[PDB]
Structure 1
Amino acid sequence: IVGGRRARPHAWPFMVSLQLRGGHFCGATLIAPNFVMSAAHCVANVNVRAVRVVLGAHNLSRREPTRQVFAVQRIFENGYDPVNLLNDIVILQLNGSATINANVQVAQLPAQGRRLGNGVQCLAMGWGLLGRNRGIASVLQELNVTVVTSLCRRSNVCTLVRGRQAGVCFGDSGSPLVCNGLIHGIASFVRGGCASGLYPDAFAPVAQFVNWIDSIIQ
């Protein structure tokens, strides 16, 4: 996240860090005790047997006793199309069930088909690149963004910060976009580099996939 701020510790207890040997590579969202959802582009070229699903985290540089770590048992996809950048969603079934508590909670999802209007205020978040060549964040970042339909396809939810350069970046892939208390997006792609101040950030539109999500988480 470029131009955001540190989240309050454990403000977003559905927020997940996907990790490989020495560290974070993508975000995800806890959507049931034994399932997370992320971006398909996060895992397309990675050995899922090596992925660690880290719940309850805040500062990735510290040992945090709040964390719970799972492996991935199974992946469910929904027509990921990397050429057209469509259907950028994956569900990862965990090898066990999270212990739900103050620091680890299941996200709330929208109803199937619910679109967001121009001007909806959301929060993006993640442990991705901070901009100004600062690398991956240690402390979870959040960012106020606004939904836009301009320079966006109907197959995405897009967002833009106005009046300054700010937005999601590498390593924010797969992270939730929270709008009116519900997870409406999964970070998918940027144009113009991160935080261009021109192109909106694009998210997989969670509302388009809710019946599919529900069918899996049961």
Structure 2
Amino acid sequence: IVGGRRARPHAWPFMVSLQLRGGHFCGATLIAPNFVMSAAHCVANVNVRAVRVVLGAHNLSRREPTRQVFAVQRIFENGYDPVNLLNDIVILQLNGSATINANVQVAQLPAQGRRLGNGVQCLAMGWGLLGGIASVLQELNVTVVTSLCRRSNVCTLVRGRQAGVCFGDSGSPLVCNGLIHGIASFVRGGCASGLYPDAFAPVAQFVNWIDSIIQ
């Protein structure tokens, strides 16, 4: 996250860090005690039997008793198309269920088909680059835009300055009105161009598919 601020510790207890080889590589969202969702592009080209799913985290450089670590048992994807940057969504089934507490909570999703209009105020978050990787979870006020966005994305822009999501933020949730409306997918013109909206997988188009996977 470029140009944001520290989240309050455990402000977003659905926020997940996917790790490989002791390092964060993508964000994700806990959507049931035993399923996280992320971007398909994050797990394309990775050994998924090696991905560590970290719940309850805040400061990644610190040892945190609040953390709960899971392996991935299985993944599910619906038409992921890297060539057209479409359907950039994956559900990872964990090898167990999270203990649900103050630090670890299931996110709330929109109803299937719910569209966000131009100007809706959201919060993006993640442990991606600050412009230097982030140890502390960052969040950022963003605005939904329909300009320079296709139908197949939710897009957001920080109005008036250069700020947005960056490498390592992929897979992270976009929260609008308490609801997960996007999963961070791609940037244009580099991170925090000041011009191209950030693009998110549009979670609301996938809700019936998500529901049937999680039960």
Aligned mates of 2:186, 2:192 — CA distance in 1: 12
Aligned mates of 1:70, 1:22 — CA distance in 2: 13
How far did 1:21 drift? 1.1
Matched residue of 1:104: which SS? coil
Of 135, 138, 144, 1:138 maps to 135
How far did 1:53 drift? 0.1
How far did 1:5 drift? 0.1
Q: Which residue of structure 2 aligns with residue 163 of structure 1?
A: 160
What is the RMSD of the two structures over their aligned residues, measured on CA atoms?
A: 0.3
Aligned mates of 1:104, 1:202 — CA distance in 2: 26
Matched residue of 1:184: which SS? strand
Aligned mates of 1:109, 1:121 — CA distance in 2: 16
**Partner deviation per Cα, 1:150-194 (whole Å, 9 max, x = no partner):** 000000000000110000000000000000010000000000000
Output the TM-score relative to the length of structure 2: 1.00
Alignment of 1:207 onto 2:184: no
**Partner deviation per Cα, 1:97-135 (whole Å, 9 max, x = no partner):** 00000000000000000000000000000000001xxx2
Aligned mates of 2:182, 2:129 — CA distance in 1: 19
Matched residue of 2:71: which SS? strand
How far did 1:22 drift? 2.2
Aligned mates of 2:76, 2:145 — CA distance in 1: 29
Within 5 Å, give how 1:165-204 maps onto structure 2: 165-204=162-201
Aligned mates of 2:151, 2:194 — CA distance in 1: 21
Aligned mates of 2:22, 2:36 — CA distance in 1: 21
Q: Which residue of structure 1 aligns with residue 83 of structure 2?
A: 83
Aligned mates of 1:7, 1:118 — CA distance in 2: 25
**Partner deviation per Cα, 1:63-113 (whole Å, 9 max, x = no partner):** 000000000000001110000000000000000000000000000000000
How far did 1:136 drift? 1.4
Matched residue of 2:201: which SS? strand
How far did 1:16 drift? 0.1
Aligned mates of 2:38, 2:65 — CA distance in 1: 24
Aligned mates of 2:149, 2:20 — CA distance in 1: 32
Matched residue of 1:122: which SS? strand
Within 5 Å, give how 1:106-145 maps onto structure 2: 106-131=106-131, 135-145=132-142
How far did 1:144 drift? 0.1
How many residues end up aligned between the 2 structures? 215
Q: Which runs of 4+ in 1 moved over 3 A?
A: none
Matched residue of 1:49: which SS? helix
Output the TM-score relative to the length of structure 1: 0.98
Segments of 5+ residues of structure 1 without an aligned counterpart are: none
